[PDB]
Scaffold this active site. Structure first.
Site, PDB file in Angstrom:
ATOM      1  N   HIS B 229      -4.768 -10.547 -12.046  1.00 35.65           N
ATOM      2  CA  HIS B 229      -5.788 -10.808 -11.036  1.00 35.65           C
ATOM      3  C   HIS B 229      -5.203 -10.749  -9.630  1.00 35.65           C
ATOM      4  CE1 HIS B 229      -9.502 -12.586  -9.394  1.00 35.65           C
ATOM      5  NE2 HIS B 229      -8.694 -13.285  -8.616  1.00 35.65           N
ATOM      6  N   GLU B 233      -6.176  -7.580  -6.951  1.00 38.82           N
ATOM      7  CA  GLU B 233      -6.815  -7.770  -5.653  1.00 38.82           C
ATOM      8  C   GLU B 233      -5.962  -7.194  -4.528  1.00 38.82           C
ATOM      9  OE1 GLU B 233      -9.757  -8.682  -5.159  1.00 38.82           O
ATOM     10  OE2 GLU B 233     -10.302  -9.442  -7.146  1.00 38.82           O
ATOM     11  N   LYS B 236      -6.286  -3.336  -4.438  1.00 34.14           N
ATOM     12  CA  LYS B 236      -7.557  -2.839  -3.921  1.00 34.14           C
ATOM     13  C   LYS B 236      -7.551  -2.805  -2.397  1.00 34.14           C
ATOM     14  CE  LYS B 236     -10.152  -5.688  -6.319  1.00 34.14           C
ATOM     15  NZ  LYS B 236     -11.386  -6.392  -6.762  1.00 34.14           N
ATOM     16  N   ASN B 237      -7.068  -3.878  -1.766  1.00 37.32           N
ATOM     17  CA  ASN B 237      -7.003  -3.905  -0.309  1.00 37.32           C
ATOM     18  C   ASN B 237      -5.978  -2.908   0.216  1.00 37.32           C
ATOM     19  OD1 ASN B 237      -8.837  -6.289   0.482  1.00 37.32           O
ATOM     20  ND2 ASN B 237      -7.519  -7.194  -1.095  1.00 37.32           N
TER      21      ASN B 237
HETATM   22  C1  LIG Z   1      -5.929  -2.769   7.182  1.00 37.30           C
HETATM   23  C2  LIG Z   1      -5.746  -3.811   6.094  1.00 37.30           C
HETATM   24  N1  LIG Z   1      -4.660  -3.597   5.314  1.00 37.30           N
HETATM   25  C3  LIG Z   1      -4.454  -4.507   4.322  1.00 37.30           C
HETATM   26  N2  LIG Z   1      -3.408  -4.469   3.420  1.00 37.30           N
HETATM   27  C4  LIG Z   1      -3.508  -5.554   2.548  1.00 37.30           C
HETATM   28  C5  LIG Z   1      -2.687  -5.952   1.461  1.00 37.30           C
HETATM   29  C6  LIG Z   1      -1.452  -5.177   1.044  1.00 37.30           C
HETATM   30  C7  LIG Z   1      -0.561  -5.496  -0.137  1.00 37.30           C
HETATM   31  C8  LIG Z   1      -0.044  -5.670   1.277  1.00 37.30           C
HETATM   32  C9  LIG Z   1      -3.048  -7.118   0.747  1.00 37.30           C
HETATM   33  C10 LIG Z   1      -4.185  -7.865   1.101  1.00 37.30           C
HETATM   34  C11 LIG Z   1      -4.989  -7.461   2.177  1.00 37.30           C
HETATM   35  C12 LIG Z   1      -4.669  -6.304   2.919  1.00 37.30           C
HETATM   36  C13 LIG Z   1      -5.261  -5.632   4.044  1.00 37.30           C
HETATM   37  C14 LIG Z   1      -6.378  -5.815   4.880  1.00 37.30           C
HETATM   38  C15 LIG Z   1      -6.638  -4.902   5.919  1.00 37.30           C
HETATM   39  C16 LIG Z   1      -7.809  -5.153   6.745  1.00 37.30           C
HETATM   40  N3  LIG Z   1      -8.547  -4.280   7.439  1.00 37.30           N
HETATM   41  N4  LIG Z   1      -9.537  -5.016   8.048  1.00 37.30           N
HETATM   42  C17 LIG Z   1      -9.329  -6.279   7.673  1.00 37.30           C
HETATM   43  C18 LIG Z   1     -10.125  -7.483   8.063  1.00 37.30           C
HETATM   44  C19 LIG Z   1     -10.804  -8.083   6.810  1.00 37.30           C
HETATM   45  C20 LIG Z   1     -11.569  -7.037   6.008  1.00 37.30           C
HETATM   46  O1  LIG Z   1     -12.681  -6.673   6.377  1.00 37.30           O
HETATM   47  N5  LIG Z   1     -10.965  -6.556   4.917  1.00 37.30           N
HETATM   48  C21 LIG Z   1     -11.482  -5.523   4.031  1.00 37.30           C
HETATM   49  C22 LIG Z   1     -11.580  -6.023   2.579  1.00 37.30           C
HETATM   50  C23 LIG Z   1     -10.589  -4.297   4.149  1.00 37.30           C
HETATM   51  C24 LIG Z   1     -11.016  -3.180   4.903  1.00 37.30           C
HETATM   52  C25 LIG Z   1     -10.193  -2.044   5.017  1.00 37.30           C
HETATM   53  C26 LIG Z   1      -8.937  -2.019   4.383  1.00 37.30           C
HETATM   54  C27 LIG Z   1      -8.505  -3.128   3.633  1.00 37.30           C
HETATM   55  C28 LIG Z   1      -9.328  -4.266   3.518  1.00 37.30           C
HETATM   56  C29 LIG Z   1      -9.324  -8.468   8.969  1.00 37.30           C
HETATM   57  C30 LIG Z   1      -8.959  -7.885  10.347  1.00 37.30           C
HETATM   58  C31 LIG Z   1     -10.008  -9.840   9.126  1.00 37.30           C
HETATM   59  O2  LIG Z   1      -8.257  -6.430   6.857  1.00 37.30           O
END
Ligand SMILES: Cc1nc2[nH]c3c(C4CC4)cccc3c2cc1-c1nnc([C@@H](CC(=O)N[C@H](C)c2ccccc2)C(C)C)o1
Ligand SMILES: Cc1nc2[nH]c3c(C4CC4)cccc3c2cc1-c1nnc([C@@H](CC(=O)N[C@H](C)c2ccccc2)C(C)C)o1
Ligand SMILES: [Cl-]
Ligand SMILES: [Cl-]
Lengths: 340, 340
Positions: B229, B233, B236-237
């Protein structure tokens, strides 16, 4: 005397945080010496008084120690030294030249505060114990006390360096600071120290990531001396770990550094292969009490980063190595003083 | 009824944290079904009552919401369902078989609590606002409420999986769990989802670092479903960021993963090149309130890690990418339940 009265009066005022832009404008030319004199003769007492009031609100077991009283003595003397200029005339250049000389004396008077305050932490450990609650109370005060000291020394250095005698650098601020150059300078110093103690030194590898302008060198408005201090302390710990972990090996992994420039943050990662640190002991690296023994480089290095809305974070992997990221504000408009 | 009385009685008892060893011994054979029945008929009420008392101590603006009352209804019904077995005879196998069937009903009754509690967060945001103080109070409760739910479901699953009918896996615990295999399984699932939504998927790269036994595959005693899990998660991000950041490019950087085994910690880093996240917004990733809109994967993923004395930490570099480390205890003796 009137020291308890001055503290009470100027403690009602709140410290005024300044921005990199305001610092640059205060030292644009030599015609602002009178504007800085009128500002510092009122700001420095406020910052000195606000921290002096928190020192006096400490527990008596800490307040009555000779270390806290020796530092409290210096602060009172520096406050009074500035009281004298509240009534003098800014138009008289002799008032200005005496103010600059007075700040230099205050700067050298507090030049041994970090070691003095460290002696008190050791005394407390051996006098009352190293309790988890004692660590947080000492961490809370020292982080705010040292951050206040950094702010007061920034003001003093900006005046004594700009308004002395009669520009690329605006005092301690470099409006075009190449982060990579400061990284190399800090590595070279740690390499000299590591080559003499261990007869071996890891190599350096720098990589830049300018997102909006690929292959364009990364520059920022910052105090290079503060960035050097943070990187210098991180390199020393990374080299000792890289060498002590590969004493029985022949390969000496390099210390890699990444400089990234975004729309809001300028990060500087530093990786090593020193065998990492268990997560249970990561808090001890930034703890004044758990870093005391019969150095405060890392705790104070994180304060230098938080001084302009930054941060310094560590994340290790036991068995491999440790990483360290210096988070800085890329834009001068967001680089504002963080005061207690 | 007597529900407020049961809560008051069993709330005086403290939850008893268990270790991986104790879990393994409870399910060593099928002859311990009566020892687990005698233990769970007393432990589950205590854990259900301790969280029910904190729910009732919430502010009335949160307590009177239909979401908190629907969940509070399920907890009361599950408590009473277990009250019935306090007087029955462990020697009667019918008492045991009815206890197992009763736990399965309690498990399916609380299978929609995370979405229900998420609806309440959205209602609060639109009814009272998204204040910084409201975020911490909701974060404090949900972290403890969800961690309690994970503990109760661990006990139930360990009994319904071991003591049903009549061993490599001891229920949900795998005493020889290959971390790399769970990483590949989670990546493959996220790849299928990413290949269908974006028509492109980053590749995977795993590297193991067994410090004390180089080149020896890394194994641990852990619940693979919980590790899946957390990794699922994070993948996916990381994939959405890696793809959405390189939509106008041709190179799709891979998602690298490092598995390190030390003397006390087992870390799993996960790196991507998705353009990072500014430090100012890193707190929003683990915030229930700032992750709500008209998912709680990452906040709950960190709870799964802290459930056995672990942690999940994020550190990004805006303009480059983000890193994620899952900190786990390598030794079973240190893998003890963390209960609110
Ligand atoms: C660019 C980006 N890299 C990411 N890399 C991640 C990893 C990897 C393993 C190391 C783990 C967990 C989270 C993120 C993550 C978030 C974002 C991100 N970008 N915007 C956001 C906002 C929240 C959001 O809306 N998150 C959605 C779910 C998302 C959208 C686009 C890409 C990934 C997640 C934030 C500024 C508050 O976080
Ligand atoms: C192995 C090791 N890698 C490290 N890498 C580091 C980095 C790099 C840039 C990413 C930055 C800052 C600190 C460390 C660091 C500490 C230790 C370490 N090892 N033991 C300790 C203890 C404290 C201590 O005694 N630290 C001294 C100064 C030290 C000894 C040997 C090597 C490095 C520092 C701790 C368990 C509480 O921390
Ligand atoms: Cl000082
Ligand atoms: Cl639940």
């Amino acid at each position: 005397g009137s020291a308890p009265k001055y503290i009470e009066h100027f403690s009602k005022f709140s410290p005024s945080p300044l921005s990199m832009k305001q610092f640059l404008d205060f030292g644009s030319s030599n015609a602002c010496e009178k504007t800085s004199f009128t500002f510092l003769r009122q700001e420095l007492p406020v910052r000195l008084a606000n921290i002096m009031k928190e020192i006096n609100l400490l527990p008596d077991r800490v307040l009555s120690t000779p270390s806290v009283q020796l530092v409290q003595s210096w602060y009172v003397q520096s406050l009074l030294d500035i009281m004298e200029f509240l009534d003098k005339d800014p138009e008289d250049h002799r008032t200005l030249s005496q103010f600059t000389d007075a700040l230099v004396t205050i700067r050298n008077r507090h030049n041994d505060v970090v070691p003095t305050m460290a002696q008190g932490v050791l005394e407390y450990k051996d006098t009352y114990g190293d309790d988890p609650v004692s660590n947080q109370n000492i961490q809370y005060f020292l982080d705010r006390f040292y951050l206040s000291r950094i702010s007061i020394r920034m003001l003093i250095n900006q005046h004594t360096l700009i308004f002395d005698g009669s520009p690329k650098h605006i005092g301690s601020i470099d409006p075009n600071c190449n982060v990579s150059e400061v990284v190399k300078d800090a590595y070279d110093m740690a390499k000299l120290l590591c080559d003499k103690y261990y007869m071996a030194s890891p190599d350096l590898e720098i990589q830049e990531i300018n997102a909006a302008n690929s292959k364009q060198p990364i520059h920022m408005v910052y105090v290079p001396s503060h960035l050097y201090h943070m990187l210098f302390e991180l390199f020393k710990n990374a080299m000792r770990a890289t060498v002590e972990s590969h004493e029985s090996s022949l390969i000496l992994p390099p210390i890699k550094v990444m400089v990234a420039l975004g729309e809001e943050d300028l990060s500087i990662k530093m990786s090593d292969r020193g065998g990492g640190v268990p997560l249970r002991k990561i808090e001890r690296l930034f703890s004044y009490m758990y870093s005391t023994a019969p150095g405060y480089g890392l705790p104070i290095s994180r304060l230098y980063a938080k001084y302009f809305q930054g941060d310094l974070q560590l994340f290790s992997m036991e068995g491999f190595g440790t990483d360290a990221v210096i988070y800085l504000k890329a834009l001068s408009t967001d680089s504002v003083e963080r005061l207690p």
